[PDB]
Amino acid sequence: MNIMLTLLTNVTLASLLVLIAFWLPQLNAYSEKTSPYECGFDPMGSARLPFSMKFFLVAITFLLFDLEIALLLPLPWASQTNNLKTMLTMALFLLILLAASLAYEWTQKGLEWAE
């Protein structure tokens, strides 16, 4: 109840601020003022052209790594089991595999951006 009330209040305040910003001052917009912004001249192409990604492999590796934290986050509760040896071994095994994957990607020049 309280959390959605907070979210509604924040959204309403932001929307009201936008409304005041857009309806209070005097608006005088013509075709030249609203043109797309380059430094001083007209853009040659378009901003919707494909834009090369030199770190795509790092992006996919981040996609895979973002679930290692998902697996590791329950550790504060996992550290409360009776058999701490098995839990410790499993946690260390998971972290060792994470480190080994990172090392493999490091040595094979996977962290270097494309030229």
Partner: protein, 83 residues
């Protein structure tokens, strides 16, 4: 055991971050086995009463089962108070 000294010196001169991380990881891997306090942690974990201790029906042949919480029988956490 001679070339490893030069390799360690070169690694410490060039990339100390990797050396420190490997040392910390190795310490965290080996030391818990040798620590005598791990069993204390396991016992402390076992001694936490999350759920209700269900009483046992008396059949007249349970000398080690206390008849009351204050009776001398049963597990004791006197070792925990000194820890």
């Amino acid at each position: 055991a001679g070339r490893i000294a030069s390799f360690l010196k070169n690694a410490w001169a060039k990339e100390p971050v990797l050396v420190a991380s490997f040392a910390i990881g190795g310490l965290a891997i080996i030391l818990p086995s040798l620590s005598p306090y791990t069993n204390y942690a396991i016992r402390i974990n076992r001694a936490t009463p999350y759920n209700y201790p269900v009483p046992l029906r008396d059949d007249g042949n349970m000398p080690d089962v206390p008849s009351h919480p204050q009776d001398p029988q049963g597990p004791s956490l006197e070792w925990l108070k000194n820890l």
